């Protein structure tokens, strides 16, 4: 059905980049907008931004308006969130979240990713 | 930064009963959702549209509330049920998901 | 008629008067405590909120024929317009710039398709109308319908979908919770509606199933095939059709308060706790009472201040730039009558909802009477100073002249012939009555004092007892008015109504009065009054002319048309 | 320049003239005979008469469904309002809050019944709607609408009759003989129309079998579920529906006439013909012909002399109930414009229909003209009489001081340097010619007697001809103004542009005039005219504004609905 | 309190005056080169262009029955109004006052006929409606409609076809494209469509076989059953109704200006660059600018001068007959508001589209400032010229009395107590300071020269110890060199201080106090009074929502009831699976 392969767990030294895949599968991927979320080890949840693969459309939470930037690949339809200016506090599990065009009352994360783990240390 | 205060932080009940759960806004939200989240996973699409049921959920669930006011309820509280509830909303850029509870059993 | 003389008897020293003193001189303060300033009047906006919207909708149209002998007659014609969904508007149309042939819709609570000339269908593309002209767009895909006729005395069906999209002018009334298309079409929801950053709260009649909402929406621009810039566009599907309009806050949109008139020099003055703009270059005077008037009581009044200041700013600086400075930020005041003044003072280098009168005309008579009233009541005060200042002057010239002939002035004072005298420094006066009747007047002859030829008298002896005449028909008692006999002695006197003329202190004749020349001491002053009027109700256009304007009334062809079966059918009678 | 003289021949006594004697002054009376009293005006009413009503229709759809092989088309949907006969509506709703199931009506002559659902008939409730608000309540049975599909290629047919109560707001105009709904339909006949008090006269176009009036008839409330208070209830069946409205007589309801504004205070003047009712709370002067005004001329004027009664009988009770008393009964003027102005009278205790003008700007005019004609006037009339006494009264100033120096001052009020004389009560005058060129003047040095020394001179001698220096630039031809020679002799005077100094008659010096200071005797009175003004034609709201209050325009939604069958197809096109 | 006493010591010849010389009267030339004449006044005509014409349609109604039981249920009426055709127009109706039965038109591109009844075609006469008033009037065929049963469980189709003729009212607006009729139909052409004088220029959207022109066309009136008279009839046949009207050509119609108000005599004067054109009947003032107005600049304006020389020449004719004369062609001006004034002036025997304001009350406010500004200005004149010329005479009062008493009126002049003398035709004057404090004045007790009996005082003596006598208003003469002779009945009031001491026989006798005396008034009273303040309140005959409160129906508020009929009354959000 519908899946979300995401890039799996990376580690990191501080102050480099990374560059997290959700590679999707299962429906028309070119009309279906894909959210980011952070969920910090035992914190609460924490919205990122999304990308429209149509359009090329962007949001972004202001509290991430630095940390991260978004694009999609066309092709082998995936979703790159890449991050620059690592900190030590960004040790968190990901999220990638499928979530409709429209905002209609039937709009909802209907589909997550199996959840990427990052750490950052030496 | 439309903080949502999911009241009870952990809900304990004894297996049967019917439990509550608050998500209170600041200011108000046209339609308050829900996810879970089984520990060591990713979180499931709950409620959507503060009533509906999601697809593939029990019927024993309800959600209910309007304005800065949703409640959760369940009917008959079962042990599959030790989730983590977020309660979250798109109404207001950015998206903001509650604190989040987390339920026990009685045993 | 009889002419009358008077009779001054010895004047006793009883009634005793002196001259009023000056009296003092009233000032009128006249003069007001002024401050000019820069003012912009706003007034109640009435106009419905008109913006721009777009429909799409199909066209259902099946016809049944009946192939006869020799014709083919219609039975039925049911046409209908259904929505086009927008899964569609965003995928074939909006990608495209197609539509599809097959029309699906919802018709009394079952689902329904329907083909265009029952065929396969087709994503057929949008052609532009023949009338687009600009300020009316459409884009239709069909110019035919469809129907036939089969075999005779059979009945067919056919079905024609024409896919329609058309540029509308949407428009709507306060307080802003549904809007009227230009296709004659009510919706029934606020133009602000949607679901992010409070929009919900906007009233709405329709199920949320219906709304949808984009953000970054590229809309196609069938015309030059190209896609818009990006906005954030609503979608709204009715029962008939479907709405799609670039969605916008309210809060930039309406406003309660649109700008009547900027003004460039007013001059606030200051009644008994009311305001005054008079604003001279529009003839019109405005009244507010002296609080100011937080314009947070209005709904909508969020775009006058800051409007506002962007045009005194501009006015300051174009104008008042070296002349004057500013003396505080800008003030609100209620004008009488529903205006809206905002005024920013200057110096010198020395919730509800305002209902506005139709008609200023109140304003430009309060112009008009306080600029008559401040310039006549200037005026009269002229007067009276000055007056004041004559009359003071002229005294000094009474009181100097006095010692001269006391009697002659103090008559004209009192209205009255009496007889004065000087005792010292106060005047003591005594009344002469009227000669009566039954009396001789006897004019004498000679002046001469008899013997005594170097010895003559002044003014004429009489004889009634035996005088001689006064001045103004005063007839003296005795005959003490004597003089040196001078020669070439050519005098008049007034009696009666005749000069009587003396040559030589002797009689030579007499001489009426009229025959004397005049000369004039009084100073014309020719002031005529005002003429009454009547002002007659002058009205530019009746009331019916104001509305016969109209291509059409629509209670004047419902009027006609409601009654059609009644004066073309007889409704009355029954078939058994 | 050259200083002018004066040479004064000796005067030759054949012009005498004597001081015009004093002037009558006139009396401006000015005063209107008033009479004050309260009023209360009225204007044309111009509003539709409104009650509320109540429809009783039912709603009839039949649905023709054709079932595809993987959908389903509606064919046909006819759409049809059939009347609630009026037994259904006293016998089952007003009995027990149902409605019945069958449609029983009449279309083209014949009697035709429709079923919902095609079931038998069933008593179904009456539920309210979900959107009753307050204003607009309706009730219905039904939230459904019925068709059914088939099987495949064939067609069927369904039937949905929905039974719907609303209540209206009814709406009619003059001559009251129409009633429009709030649902659009006209319905014929005057809503005064009734079967008791001759109001079977009214106007109808219905035959009298579709009337039903019914006396101390009980609405059923559909909510509270209880019976209303008896009224006599009228019922009419339309070809569509049935309205049902309370009947009230005619005169009770409309009124040619309405109250515009009461006045506590006028005062009625009288003008030739007319009268004046100046309403100084107002600044409003109304102005009408002198008979009184029989109000039988005007349809439907019954409210009037019963209303305004009510109204003065308040006025006169709280305000004017110690200082003042009526003076007769009520009176009736047409004011010019338009309106009614009923004048009740006090004193202190010493057929066609009215058309009102749009405007009563034309009467504050004619109020504020004559507040200031009444006060310009009065005080005009106060400077030409206190000018009249002031000239009478300088008269004897004049006249008192005509023995001193008659010269001076008769050529101040003749304009013109003449020498007179007193030949007793007269004056006799001459002229005075210039002194040209060709003449040499030689002013002298002493005014000293030659061989004299106690006699000395009055005036300096000149020699021109040896005479002597008068003054204001006469030149006296003779030597006669000698003086007992007096020292300290410090004197001036004037010669040419230069006045001389003389001390101890002997010549000093000479001085420019201007070198001299001066004092001035002329009272300052600085008057200051009015300026010309334009008065721009300021309108609050244009023509365009005032019909853009809309929310849709009739004739433009028409413009652009009728050529929809021209836009989106062709229709020139024939098929063979 | 206490009074003050002025000293007037020697005067000393250092300052001179002369009394100023009489001014100069000024005058105000107030008067205007007028030109009196006649004037109409023309202003925008808003109403809409109204004609008569006539609608040809048949009503065609297809009914299908379908017999139940006990009962007869319709289940379709599809009603359609077709046109009638010209060729059936000016052959059948025009000339026998009949329509027929067969209804032939067009829908879908298709040919389609119709039978009334499913009979052959007859030729129906045309009968007079039953509300056949004067202004609506109609004829038709058939006051009945066709319905056919049939068997029960079976369905029947009737068909009726009803001729129907109506006068209507048609109705355009500018620029006059389209025309409304008065059942509600857009017709989508100019009225003034034709084929002569260049009118097949004008708009139209149909094609142009739809359209019909006849010249000569004789009308049948359908009641008289006659034939009117010929004149050229339009036929235009849409796809629901066939629309004939008698053409009339487009110049002689409409018109952009409407009259407004005949006047019999105006005045013009000659402002700064203005005119003005006070209409004192109507008390009205109108400014234009002193140029010329063209009125071919303004869209269809030939009905300004005609119908203007139409009037002018009668109100010239019946009232300026024998007093005036003409002096000029008529002449046009655009007034201040968008006026059109044609003004024609007398003389004694001696591209755009002009938009009107709603309201002439700025110009009666023009007219009544202007008559005040006019009078008030002319009564003020009047004041400044005799005020002056009163003070020019004055001067010869002042100038004739100086010989008598000096030192009173040179005081009044200066406002100062002074000391004056006449140094033969100049006044050298003296100031007089008071007399300060502790200084006792004992007035004396006789008036007699201590030696002497002829001969005695004329002022009383006084002890200041300084020996002098009292002068006047306080005047203390530092001397006694006031003697006359001693004359009997020497009563003699003198003012002092506050009291006016009484002296007879040259004796004193007792004092009294000053407002013991009564007085008389030279004053002149002159009680003027100011204009009060005023508040005009906004007064309003009707209100906004009054002058929409007069139709029968309004269309936006049955459109908002209709248009959620299916919301209120039906569940349109539930679907059946």
Known sequence: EVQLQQSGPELVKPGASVKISCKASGYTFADYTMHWVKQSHGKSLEWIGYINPYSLFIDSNQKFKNKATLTVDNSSYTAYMELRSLTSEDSAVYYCARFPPYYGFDSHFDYWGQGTALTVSS | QIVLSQSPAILSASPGEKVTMTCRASSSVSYIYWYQQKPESSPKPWIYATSNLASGVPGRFSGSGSGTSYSLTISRVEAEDAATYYCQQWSYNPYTFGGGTKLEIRR | ?576
Request: hydrophobic residues 35%.
């Open chain 3, 1 to 576: 008629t009889k002419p009358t003389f008077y009779v001054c008897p010895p004047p006793t020293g009883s009634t005793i008067v002196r001259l009023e003193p000056t009296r003092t001189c009233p000032d009128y303060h006249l003069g007001k405590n002024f401050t000019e300033g820069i003012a912009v009047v706003y007034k109640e906006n009435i106009a419905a909120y008109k913006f721009k919207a777009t429909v799409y909708y199909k066209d259902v149209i099946v016809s049944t024929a009946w192939a006869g002998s020799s014709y083919t007659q219609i039975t039925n014609r049911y046409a209908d317009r259904v929505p086009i969904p927008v899964s569609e508007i965003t995928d074939t149309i909006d990608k495209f710039g197609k539509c599809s042939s097959k029309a699906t819709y919802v018709r009394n609570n079952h689902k329904v398709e329907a083909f265009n000339e029952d065929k396969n269908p087709q994503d057929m593309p949008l052609i532009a109308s023949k009338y687009n002209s600009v300020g009316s767009k459409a884009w239709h895909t069909t110019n035919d319908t469809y129907m036939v006729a089969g075999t005779p005395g059979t009945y067919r069906t056919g079905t024609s979908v024409n896919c329609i999209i058309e540029e509308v002018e949407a428009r709507s009334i306060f307080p802003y919770d549904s809007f009227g298309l230009s296709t004659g079409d009510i919706i029934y929801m606020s133009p602000f509606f949607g679901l992010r950053d409070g929009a919900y709260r906007e009233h709405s009649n329709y199920a949320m199933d219906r709304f949808h909402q984009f953000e970054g929406y590229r809309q196609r621009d069938l015309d030059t095939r190209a896609l818009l810039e990006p906005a954030a566009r609503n979608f709204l599907v009715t029962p008939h059709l479907t709405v799609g309009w670039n969605w916008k806050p309210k809060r930039t949109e309406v406003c309660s308060l649109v700008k009547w008139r900027e003004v460039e020099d007013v001059v606030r003055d200051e009644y008994a706790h009311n305001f005054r703009f008079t604003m001279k270059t529009l003839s019109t005077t405005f009244i507010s009472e002296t609080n100011e008037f937080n314009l947070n009581q209005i709904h909508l009044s969020q775009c006058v201040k800051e409007e506002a200041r962007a045009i005194i700013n501009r006015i300051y600086t174009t104008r008042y730039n070296s002349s004057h400075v500013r003396t505080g930020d800008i003030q609100t005041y209620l004008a009488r009558g529903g205006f809206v003044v905002v005024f920013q003072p200057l110096l010198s280098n020395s919730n509800r909802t305002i209902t506005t009168t139709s008609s200023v005309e109140f304003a430009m008579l309060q112009f008009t009477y306080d600029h008559i009233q401040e310039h006549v009541n200037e005026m009269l005060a002229r007067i009276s100073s000055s007056w004041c200042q004559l009359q003071n002057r002229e005294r000094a010239l009474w009181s100097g002249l006095f010692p001269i002939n006391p009697s002659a002035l103090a008559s004209t004072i009192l209205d009255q012939r009496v007889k004065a005298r000087i005792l010292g420094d106060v005047i003591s006066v005594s009344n002469c009555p009227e000669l009566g009747s039954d009396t001789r007047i006897i004019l004498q002859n000679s002046m001469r004092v008899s013997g005594s030829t170097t010895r003559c008298y002044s003014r004429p002896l009489i004889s009634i007892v035996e005088g001689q005449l006064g001045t103004d028909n005063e007839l003296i008692m005795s005959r003490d008015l004597l003089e040196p006999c001078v020669a070439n002695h050519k005098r008049y006197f007034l009696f009666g109504h005749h000069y009587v003329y003396y040559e030589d202190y002797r009689y030579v004749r007499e001489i009426a009065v009229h025959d004397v020349g005049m000369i004039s001491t009084y100073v014309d002053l020719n002031l005529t009054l005002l003429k009454d009027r009547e002002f007659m109700p002058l009205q530019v256009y009746t009331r019916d002319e104001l509305r016969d304007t109209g291509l059409l009334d629509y209670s004047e062809i419902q009027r006609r048309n409601q009654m059609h079966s009644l004066r073309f059918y007889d409704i009355d009678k029954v078939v058994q």
